[PDB]
């Protein structure tokens, strides 16, 4: 792919998301979604191989079905209200269809399989962009339409997402599938807190994006896509393994790291509204995520797996490409707990 | 065999290379000064000075003050024929029972 | 030592929970990645959400 | 030792009084804020929870093709 | 599901044990049908007869669990003359867990199911008594 | 060699200066809680002829 | 979520098409122009909750 | 969403004109010091990742890290203080406007209040 | 409290900027200086605590624990010197950094004035301990030990976080002074029962409680010497401190919910002592003895009488010191013979006289020989339990008999008898090891001389 074409497609994806986030018209929001998907498909199919083609095909099918459902919901809402402005939807059936379409776009359970499938199919940069941006946009739409969301359905989908992410991450071995299930669990947390405080939703989004960027960029730096491939990193650059370990600890919600702040704020907000059982179950279920994070950290940082012989040549040579904002994302993902009251600024 | 692994090394004895070893370091001078600073600081400073400091800490718990106040109250009570210990902690005149 | 500490106290809390989580993880991730299958699951979820949610 | 390393009981006493005042005020403010948030979300007559509505400036009041607009 | 739950809650606790058991059996049958549909969708059966057999097995297991729970809880409450007691729900839940263990032919599964189901049924009864809500409406 | 002594033993002032800074910060925090100074019922007292604050 | 660039910069990207009581070509009125105008003028400036109530 | 939709809110404005009536954060603020500490840590991590002497290489870029973090932290603190002040102002206004919803209660002394005593034995 | 907090955050850069051969010397010297500075916190008042600021305060319960932590750090440094000779400079500095961070988190946890900050720091202590165990442990089971430890603690403590945020929303503040002055009785309902369960179960899993204690042998056996020293002496006391702090708002429901935990704790004392009778591993014996002592502390806290809190505090301090000394002795014996089996090496009194003396003194302090603070705390707890009921005396008596039995059993097995013929690498005891044992044992006798400093705020 030509660099000019690649940057044009990236800017088209970003422009589609910006159009979705700045448009007050349902037709314009749908147009932004269509543009985002259209420009996103080649980014997935950059490195051409049958696995990438299959991942792109599955992603296209899922996103097209979600877009059709979203347009149907828009039309149904227009039928009973005659309004195009994105506000509290005036029809429960249209609201349910919109919620299901946005859940399918985000990856919430039971619409989650395509997330690990595509993430394994595509490369690390494609997975990073996919997760981050393609979860950034529908969450903005949901935050705009929050006041009409059915709490029962939203919380059911959120809890299912958390459980499914935990169990999938427990069983998986591939780094990209682990990241996909982590994304599913964090989206579950965000959508669980969504019907109560969109500010907490945005805070969780920002923290999750920072941690995911840090983890994916560390994986790109180490050029590891499996557990055993990552197990050789300690013999070439042990600093990266330690940074990855602290990032994994933060993603598990362990205090006093940055990952504990979203869970803490969400628990507080949900327990303000006389909801105890849901926060308790959500907090207890994150232990599965922390378990597979710790299992991944054992193989890379806290132990020394056997190495190979060409690693000496690896030592002789030096990394050339420099990651952008990697130290900043590492610091922001582990040491911003004492700056929690900035959520008022985020408000 | 399954790996190109180093054999397990024999444990080194500090007394072999230094019969006067204190067990802190394999360098003789560093070992001697580590022992000296540990002994001096810990034993002398911490033990002796902290022990005498705690022994002569001022009576902020007011044990002696409480004893003197108790003696004064006992003297005043038994001089005037009043009971040594009152029946109630608070004043029933100030306490208003619900009725 | 053996009956209580090494066997039953290990069986109740940590071993049973670990076994349950392992079985659930196998059940969740045992999917074959068939678009027909999980799109049929999507259809079932859509019908359930449309009907049994008021 | 008391003259060199420590201070009188009055300092700690009045610092504790100030701390208690601050903490009691904060607790009262938190309870009041929760009550205000609950009432505002329930009713909608306050500055908070003001969900958007259609602006009236978009309406066109010019005469139309038919008198019965 | 809401209609079935409303019927079950509208039937009085200590009385009408047959109707309570019928409501619980209906709830269990609906749950079993949903589970069977998801299982067939995700793991396809070899043949239509095998799919029908799997659906029947799941539905019968769930309906038996529900019926046993309802009957045991209502009978215990009636004989003890002590309604609004989580112990009746605990007994019903353990009975349902033992029924599941009998259906699966596994003593360990039966014991674990009895314990967990009794605990969660006691929790449900305590929530009914105390006013606990799982999906709380946005309040603050 | 005096520079080498400093270049090797300059880390022995970090803990002492940290202790001094901690004492200074403790005093500065104590100066922010003077709302009830010489105002408690138990220790309310007329100031001495040469005195402005009961405690610092 | 909603960066109101249109309101910030004074643009009209889609607010013309948002409602059917706005400026139409050749002043063609909508089917329910009067009802929509009355509803908008009632619900304007009081918030979503009060508008619905 | 609570604050969004507040009357008089100009979109995409980090600090409105009414925020200038509040005391700006002191340059010796502990939060600003923590932001500078985060910048210094980011510089050290940059040196470690790029395989340079951690505490002695790239002094100019470490200084730039610290300066950028301090700058953004100062503006973030200003916005945070403005938001909290606005929240308190709205709360007090609503409490004033709804006295029947926020009434004063009688203060009974503990001599009048009857409370049950539970012995510990 | 900043005068103690800042010197640790200065220990960090000093450790990372010191020379390769001076790290241990600098760390030990400045840790001793910080301990001397922290000795000033023992000057507590009689009525109210020391309120330094809105964030940190010191009480008669917090001060001895802070002094114990600041005193325990340099001993861990000495043990690390012992077992980390061949490590690289960067890894040694990382180990010292982990120890320093753990000490700082413990200090802030003990001096925190609010329950949520207390929870944050008390959970923050998990990371350094897990890293130390799973990174510098010697055997394969260190990963499993770390997993068990972390997940037991988190499964205990998450409902505590939910309960804490609920309590703040309901009452207004989590400040300890406010929740003590504004305390109101807890009604006997299911919701209050479950809140009580959340808080108490969190601290009991941390304590640990019998039945929730397997993580303790797993982690203590497989941890390095410094990790074992900090796990047994200080990290076990977080649960006791929390229970002594959190029970202010749980009355009178504690009078009704304490029965299962009291029975569990007493029968756990009995069971763990009996387990100690037949242990083939020395570290496991010490770990189970720690479990028994913590169960006794649990009984004291649950009965919750003024004579039981003083005994609880004294027993916590005494057990911390005694367990640290026992672990150090066991580690010396292990480093001599590279095996934890107790019957492998014998005749150690013939081969090493001074270590035999240290073993005798440590085992005498373990079995609560009067007038040691171990016995002071145990006797206060026993008297309070006797006032509570008159069969607790039977249970305490049999527990005490079995405790003496297994203490003297391990002493006789390790030190007395005929030396193993084929073990010919028993070098004379090092001055470092002798000084470590002396620094462990002398403060115990000094606290015996002056016992009012460790009897808590109810003295
Ligand atoms: C609002 C938005 C949404 C709106 C939706 C609106 C829908 C309207 C539809 C209108 C008409 C549409 C026309 C086009 C349809 C195209 C279908 C198609 O292409 O199918 C291809 C698809 C596969 O094509 P193929 O690969 O060429 O053929 C291979 C064979 O299928 C290989 O088959 P095999 O024999 O080798 O074995 C495999 C077989 C194995 O299947 C079995 O063995 C099935 C056994 C079923 C036993 C049932 C016993 C109990 C009976 C019911 C008792 C209770 C009644 C009341 C229930 C409700 C109470 C409230 O698997 C299947 O049949 C797969 C499909 C069914 C999976 C099971 C789940 C069904 C869920 C239905 C809804 C459930 C809701 C939740 C539960 C609620 C409970 C209260 O074929 C089939 O699925 C077979 C059936 C085709 C006809 C379906 C007609 C109905 C469609 C709806
Ligand atoms: C009314 C309200 C209903 C609400 C929904 C209730 C159901 C929810 C869950 C349905 C799907 C469960 C997963 C599934 O199909 O697994 C089987 C299916 C195939 O499993 P397999 O690999 O063949 O199993 C291997 C075994 O060795 C195969 O062993 P086997 O062939 O020997 O199987 C026999 C054996 C062993 O079976 C197995 O090992 C597998 C069989 C399925 C196990 C399912 C475990 C989870 C149970 C979920 C339901 C729990 C209760 C829900 C609430 C009920 C409230 C009343 O025993 C059973 O199968 C016993 C089944 C017991 C069912 C539940 C009984 C209690 C009913 C409720 C209480 C009754 C008393 C009420 C009184 C009043 O699993 C998968 O393909 C993967 C599962 C994981 C991914 C799932 C992704 C989608 C999840 C969707 C969840 C539903 C969302 C609905 C809302 C959506 C909103 C947007
Ligand atoms: C783990 C242990 C968890 C223990 C949780 C204990 C909670 C106790 C406190 C709450 C309480 O008691 O609420 C009951 C509530 C008390 O409130 P109420 O005064 O009666 O009614 C006022 C409101 O309407 C009460 O309504 P609400 O404010 O509670 O919220 C209503 C809401 C929620 O509905 C309810 O609250 C009704 C059900 C309550 C009992 C739930 C029992 C199970 C525990 C669930 C805990 C939450 C899990 C996470 C969220 C679900 C999604 C995963 O929505 C609806 O009822 C209708 C909308 C649809 C809801 C979602 C339906 C589909 C769920 C699909 C789940 C799929 C899972 C798949 C897993 C595997 C994947 C591979 O009473 C009822 O709802 C009547 C229930 C009558 C039958 C009881 C049967 C007991 C069976 C025991 C043995 C089960 C064995 C299973 C195998
Ligand atoms: C070459 C170097 C060149 C630059 C040197 C410094 C230049 C400025 C010097 C100066 O005079 O600055 C004035 C400024 C104090 O001015 P001030 O207005 O008089 O402040 C007095 C009170 O602090 C005023 O107290 P307040 O009532 O205003 O509120 C104090 C506090 C109220 O909040 C608290 O007390 C909570 C603090 C902890 C929150 C998070 C806890 C859980 C997570 C911990 C671990 C996080 C990851 C690491 O809130 C904050 O301070 C907010 C930011 C907190 C950042 C630091 C604490 C968090 C990290 C702790 C790591 C251990 O100096 C400092 O803040 C210096 C502090 C650092 C000294 C260096 C040695 C390290 C000490 C670490 C202590 C950790 C505790
Ligand atoms: C199972 C057999 C059994 O019940 O043994 C009781 C026996 C205690 O003797 P007990 O004093 O006769 O029992 C309580 C009295 O009957 C009656 O005591 P009460 O009348 O004074 O009322 C107190 C009762 C108030 O009743 C309730 O609160 C009932 C509702 C309980 C809701 C579920 C609690 C879930 C969390 C429990 C801890 C999970 C870890 O408290 C409880 O039920 C607390 C239950 C949890 C105790 C602590 C367990 C720690 C782990 C033990 C080792 C596990 C391996 O052993 C246990 O509780 C541990 C069983 C471990 C298996
Ligand atoms: C807490 C209080 C006690 C509650 C826990 C009860 C557990 C009792 C002991 C478990 C049964 C003994 C046993 O070996 O398990 C049987 C066997 C385990 O498989 P194994 O091949 O034996 O592997 C060894 C794993 N331990 O079956 C199980 O335990 C699985 C549990 C069945 C799932 C039932 C869950 C029902 C859902 C309840 C609704 C929520
Ligand atoms: C804190 C201190 C410690 C406190 C806790 C201590 C531990 C307490 C619990 C101990 C364990 C009790 C039993 C729990 C599991 C029971 C189920 C089980 O073990 O299943 C496995 C096994 C499967 O057997 P299978 O493979 O079919 O064939 C082999 C032989 N037939 O199944 C079998 O073989 C079935 C054998 C059943 C034999 C009878 C069991 C009776 C005891 C269990 C019920 C106790 C009820 C207590 C109620 C108290 C109420 C107040």
From Swiss-Prot, chain A:
Family statement drawn from the similarity comment of this UniProt entry: Belongs to the complex I subunit 2 family.
UniProt catalytic activity: a ubiquinone + NADH + 5 H(+)(in) = a ubiquinol + NAD(+) + 4 H(+)(out)
Its job: Core subunit of the mitochondrial membrane respiratory chain NADH dehydrogenase (Complex I) which catalyzes electron transfer from NADH through the respiratory chain, using ubiquinone as an electron acceptor. Essential for the catalytic activity and assembly of complex I.
Full protein name: NADH-ubiquinone oxidoreductase chain 2
Listed GO CC annotations: mitochondrial inner membrane; respiratory chain complex I
Lineage: Eukaryota, Metazoa, Chordata, Craniata, Vertebrata
Membrane-spanning intervals of the chain: 3-23, 25-45, 59-79, 89-109, 149-169, 178-198, 200-220, 237-257, 274-294, 325-345
Gene Ontology molecular function: NADH dehydrogenase (ubiquinone) activity
Membrane topology designation: Multi-pass membrane protein
Organism the protein comes from: Sus scrofa
The organism's place on the tree of life at top rank: Eukaryota
Short name of one Pfam family: NADH_dehy_S2_C
One GO BP annotation of this record: mitochondrial respiratory chain complex I assembly
Subunit structure comment from the entry: Core subunit of respiratory chain NADH dehydrogenase (Complex I) which is composed of 45 different subunits. Interacts with TMEM242.
Gene from which this protein is expressed: MT-ND2
Keywords noted in UniProt: Electron transport, Membrane, Mitochondrion, Mitochondrion inner membrane, NAD, Respiratory chain, Translocase, Transmembrane, Transmembrane helix, Transport, Ubiquinone
Subcellular localization(s) per the UniProt record: Mitochondrion inner membrane
